């Protein structure tokens, strides 16, 4: 198992070094979007907290198919002013409900090292 805690304010840099396998490893949930929301990497941790196989939802639009619950000005709506603004830190939490148990969840957004992907990390609460 990785050793980075949920909301760590370095957690961009130590992800930035990680290949697929040890985000397999984290505590936590990580998909990692583009600035449309196309899933680029999803991990082991967020497949057992929502029931998605991760290699059937790479490459998916996140806000469109895999997750219409999020599109909402309270979370695809912070994500889009992230991406415009350029500075996208942000916690907060919710309900997924769809094809799912209801599952409150934290959530942290924040934008990648690189400035151009962004990271959505989940914790059960
Ligand atoms: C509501 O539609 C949320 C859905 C969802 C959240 C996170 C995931 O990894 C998958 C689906």
């Given at each position: 198992m990785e050793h980075v805690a949920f909301g760590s304010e370095d957690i961009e840099n130590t992800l930035a070094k990680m290949d697929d396998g040890q985000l397999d490893g984290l505590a936590f949930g990580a998909i990692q979007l583009d600035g449309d929301g196309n899933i680029l990497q999803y991990n082991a941790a967020e497949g057992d907290i929502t029931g998605r196989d991760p290699k059937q939802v790479i490459?998916?639009?996140?806000?469109?198919?895999?997750?219409?619950?999020?599109?909402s000005p309270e979370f695809y709506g912070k994500f889009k002013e992230g991406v415009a603004s350029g500075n996208l830190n942000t916690m907060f939490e919710y309900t997924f409900d769809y094809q799912m148990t209801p599952t409150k969840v934290k959530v942290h957004m924040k934008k990648a090292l690189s400035g151009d992907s962004y990271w959505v990390f989940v914790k059960r609460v």
């Open positions: 490459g998916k639009n996140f806000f469109k198919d895999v997750a219409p619950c999020t599109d």
